Amino acid sequence: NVQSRGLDVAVRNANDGISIAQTAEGAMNETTNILQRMRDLSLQSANGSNSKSE
Amino acid sequence: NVQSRGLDVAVRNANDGISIAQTAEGAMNETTNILQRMRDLSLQSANGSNSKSE
């Protein structure tokens, strides 16, 4: 009985860890999107048709 | 006759002893229940998802 209750609480703890990883990974997905947008901006800026204003 | 009366009081004493043992056993049953509850709580606390408030 002690083992079964410990297994239940261990399942709860593992679910909490999965939740934390999911939240962090969603924030990381948004970070990746922003970084890709910045990469596109940097590639556009490197062209020779631009001047200081662009 | 002495022997028979002694046997009657002896079975009375044995019944009283079993009664004491049953009272103690009940107390220890609640003790184990509380101990298992604290063990579940401690296992929950050991997880890394919790902060200091939990």
From Swiss-Prot, chains A, B:
What exactly does this protein do?
A: Flagellin is the subunit protein which polymerizes to form the filaments of bacterial flagella. FlaD is not essential for flagellar synthesis and motility.
Give the family per the record: Belongs to the bacterial flagellin family.
State the remark under miscellaneous.
V.cholerae is able to differentially regulate the flagellins within the flagellum maybe to produce flagella which are particularly suited for motility within a given environment.
Where in the cell is the protein located? Secreted; Bacterial flagellum
What subunit structure does UniProt give?
Answer: Heteromer of multiple flagellin subunits including FlaA, FlaB, FlaC, FlaD and FlaE.
User: Which section of the whole protein is represented?
Assistant: 55 to 108 of 377
Q: Per the UniProt entry, what species is this protein from, by scientific name? A: Vibrio cholerae serotype O1 (strain ATCC 39315 / El Tor Inaba N16961)
Instruction: Identify the domain of life.
Output: Bacteria
Q: What is this protein called in UniProt?
A: Flagellin D
Lineage of source species = Bacteria, Pseudomonadati, Pseudomonadota, Gammaproteobacteria, Vibrionales
Give the range the annotation lists for the signal sequence: none
